[PDB]
Write a protein that binds this ligand. Structure first.
Ligand SMILES: C#CCN1C(=O)[C@@H](C)N(CC#C)c2nc(Nc3ccc4c(=O)[nH][nH]c4c3)ncc21
Length: 317
C-alpha cells in the first residue's frame, strides 16, 4: 500500500500524475493528473522502491541518460525504424509514506510479457516469430550499447508487447543494467566490485559466468541462448541450473563447437542455418569489440528468406 489508488504525485519536473490499481515488483498503472480516475487502459505505470534501493537508482539513471522521449524519437527517425523497443521515461521523484522515503519513476505501460505467451503456446515460438523478435531486439541492443549500456538479462519475462500493438516488443528491467563504456572508455576485462549480479543462469553469458563485467558480446550471446530456447523449448544445460560450474562448462564446450550445439538442440539435420551463423559471428567478438549489428540483422534476414517470408514486422504471436 505504498500509494493510495487516486493519489496524486508530483515529479521532479513538477509534472502531476495520478496512481491507478497495482499490477512483478511494486508497480501501479498511472496517468496524467485529471478529474477522471485512472482507467484499466492507462498509458503509464509507476515503479516505486525505497530511496535506498540500488536497482531503482541504476534503472532511473539508465532511463534518464538513454530513454528520454526525444532521444528515442530522434534515433527512430535517423535510423528509419518503425519503432524502438526501449520504454520511454516520463519522470521521477520522491514520495513519503509513513515517515520513510520512496523513489518513483513513470514509464510506458505495456501489455503481456512474452514468457506468459511462450507458456500459452506450449513453450514454442515459430521460426518466423523468433526471427522477427530477434531483429527488433538487435535494434534495442544496438541503441542501448551506443548509449554506453548493456542489459545483461535478456529473456522472455523482460520482453513486453505494446498495449496497442502486438507486433511491437519492448525490453524492460534495467535495474541490473551496466554502464560498460562511461564517457567512451570501455571497462577492462575484469570483475566490477560494485556489481555482484550474475544474470539469469540458463541464459547468462560466459563472461558473466567468469565473473567479469558484462559487455556487448555478452548481450548478443544471451539473445542467442534465448533464440534456441524459444525455437526448441529447451537448452542443453537446463537440468543442472543449480550448478553454475556445470552451466558455464557446457556453454564453453558448446561455444567451441557450434555444430554440436545445433546437433544437440535440433532434431538431427533440422537446424536453422541463421542461428548457427549468428552464434559463429558472436563467438568471434572480442570483449571490447563493437558488434556489426547490421551484419547480425542480415544473417537473421536470410532466415526469413529461407522460410519464404520477409521482415514485415509481423511477430505472428
Ligand atoms: C497492466 C499491465 C501489463 N503489465 C504487466 O502485467 C506486467 C508484466 N508489468 C510489469 C513488468 C515487467 C507491466 N509493466 C509495464 N511497464 C513497465 C515499463 C518499464 C519497466 C521497467 O523498466 N521495469 N519494469 C517495467 C514495467 N507495463 C505493463 C505491464
Amino acid at each position: 500500500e505504498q500509494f493510495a489508488v487516486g493519489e496524486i504525485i508530483t515529479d521532479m519536473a513538477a509534472a502531476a500524475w495520478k496512481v491507478g490499481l497495482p499490477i512483478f515488483g511494486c508497480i501501479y498503472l498511472a496517468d496524467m493528473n485529471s478529474s477522471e480516475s485512472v482507467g484499466s487502459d492507462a498509458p503509464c505505470v509507476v515503479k516505486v522502491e525505497p530511496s535506498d534501493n540500488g536497482p531503482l537508482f541504476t534503472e532511473l539513471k539508465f532511463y534518464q541518460r538513454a530513454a528520454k522521449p526525444e532521444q528515442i524519437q530522434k534515433w527512430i527517425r535517423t535510423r528509419k525504424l518503425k519503432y524502438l523497443g526501449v520504454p520511454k521515461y516520463w519522470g521521477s521523484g520522491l514520495h513519503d509514506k509513513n515517515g520513510k522515503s520512496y523513489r518513483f519513476m513513470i514509464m510506458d505501460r505495456f501489455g503481456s510479457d512474452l514468457q506468459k505467451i511462450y507458456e500459452a503456446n506450449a513453450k514454442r515460438f515459430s521460426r518466423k516469430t523468433v526471427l522477427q523478435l530477434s531483429l527488433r531486439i538487435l535494434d534495442i541492443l544496438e541503441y542501448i550499447h551506443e548509449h554506453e549500456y548493456v542489459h545483461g538479462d535478456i529473456k522472455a519475462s523482460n520482453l513486453l508487447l505494446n498495449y496497442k500493438n502486438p507486433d511491437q516488443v519492448y525490453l524492460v528491467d534495467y535495474g541490473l543494467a551496466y554502464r560498460y563504456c562511461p564517457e567512451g572508455v570501455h571497462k577492462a576485462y575484469a570483475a566490477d566490485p560494485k556489481r555482484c549480479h550474475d544474470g539469469t543462469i540458463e541464459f547468462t553469458s560466459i563472461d558473466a559466468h567468469n565473473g567479469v563485467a558484462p559487455s556487448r558480446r555478452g548481450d548478443l550471446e544471451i539473445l542467442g541462448y534465448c533464440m534456441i530456447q524459444w525455437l526448441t523449448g529447451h537448452l542443453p544445460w537446463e537440468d543442472n541450473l543449480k550448478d553454475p560450474k556445470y552451466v558455464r562448462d557446457s556453454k564453453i564446450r558448446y561455444r567451441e563447437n557450434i555444430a554440436s550445439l545445433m546437433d544437440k538442440c535440433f532434431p538431427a539435420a533440422n537446424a536453422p542455418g541463421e542461428i548457427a551463423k549468428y552464434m559463429e559471428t558472436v563467438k568471434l567478438l572480442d570483449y571490447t569489440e563493437k558488434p556489426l549489428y547490421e551484419n547480425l540483422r542480415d544473417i537473421l534476414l536470410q532466415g526469413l528468406k529461407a522460410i519464404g517470408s520477409k521482415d514485415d514486422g509481423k511477430l505472428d504471436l
